[PDB]
């Protein structure tokens, strides 16, 4: 940064066609030796020097220093990572893992530490297989996991690690029920923002919460979970996610209420939606779950 600003000062001075001798007739406030050394980039320009050279230039310190930035192309690739449901497909997750490496091999240095954290967590979620073959949520993030259990408001990253905590809990008895029920409470109380990534992250949690609930045959505040889901979709306009909710209402009406008349229609509305979205892998999977639950 030393040589960058030193070049910026010189270059701007060249455009103004002003000389070093012109800037300070007295040379008291700025020794000519100092400026020359600064333009060489060998010496860091002290803040008082920056204030002077800008006061003379007739340009504020803010505007030209504000202009490092983050390129828009990264957000395009990030959009490809979170706004494209893979549904655990073989090739759709490999394509994303290849993309994550590409993002790392193209933006690793510029991103804020929170952004690299975001990339790292979901990468573990994508490459996730089962609870037996992969490390616990604590073992990989002890410090972060203990903070989110006591924290009131979660961020986008906190929703991700909690989501990973859900993946490690599926099909797994011998679990701390209280930690689970505390977390699902905090999650439901989270206010829906305008940020897409937060809602998507929150959506993944809510789907995961209901997922574990069905497997463990627990239906406490199940209505509340869906109400959150629908509220998210209404505010985020993620109509592409709405088929997933229909699947949840299906297995609920099938297991809890013991209904098959309304369980079939919920599957039906999901299959139809998966069709109009032209999502092949979605359609064939959700209709396979229909037959798996002893339906047409």
């Amino acid at each position: 940064i030393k040589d960058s600003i030193g070049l910026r000062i010189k270059t701007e001075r060249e455009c103004q066609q002003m000389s070093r001798e012109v800037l300070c007739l007295d040379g008291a406030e700025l020794t000519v030796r100092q400026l020359i050394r600064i333009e060489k980039g060998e010496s860091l320009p002290s803040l008082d020097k920056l204030s002077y050279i800008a006061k003379r230039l007739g340009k504020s310190m803010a505007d030209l220093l504000d202009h490092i930035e983050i390129p828009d192309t990264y957000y395009e690739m990030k959009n490809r990572l979170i706004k494209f449901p893979t549904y655990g497909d073989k090739e759709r997750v490999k394509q994303k893992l290849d993309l994550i490496e590409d993002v790392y091999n193209q933006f690793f240095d510029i991103l804020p530490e929170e952004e690299l954290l975001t990339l790292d967590i979901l990468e573990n979620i994508l490459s996730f297989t089962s609870w037996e073959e992969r490390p616990k949520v604590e073992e990989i993030y002890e410090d972060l996991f203990e903070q989110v259990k006591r924290k009131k408001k979660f961020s986008t990253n906190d929703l991700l690690v909690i989501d990973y905590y859900f993946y490690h809990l599926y099909g797994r008895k011998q679990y701390d029920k209280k930690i689970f029920d505390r977390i699902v409470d905090r999650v439901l109380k989270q206010n829906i923002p305008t940020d897409d990534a937060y809602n998507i992250a929150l959506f993944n949690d809510l789907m995961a919460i209901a997922g574990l609930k069905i497997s463990l045959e627990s239906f406490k505040d199940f209505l509340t979970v869906i109400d959150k889901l629908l509220a998210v979709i209404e505010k985020s306009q993620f109509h592409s996610y709405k088929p997933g909710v229909y699947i949840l209402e299906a297995k609920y009406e099938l297991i809890h209420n013991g209904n098959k008349k309304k369980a079939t229609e919920n599957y039906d509305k999901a299959i139809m939606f998966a069709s109009v979205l032209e999502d092949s892998v979605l359609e064939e999977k959700t209709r396979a779950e229909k037959a798996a639950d002893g339906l047409g």
């Binding site: 655990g88 993946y167 599926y170 993944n204 997922g211 999977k285």
Partner: peptide, 8 residues
């Protein structure tokens, strides 16, 4: 883990 849990 079921397919409809992975929305990523």
């Amino acid at each position: 883990v079921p397919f409809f849990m992975i929305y990523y």
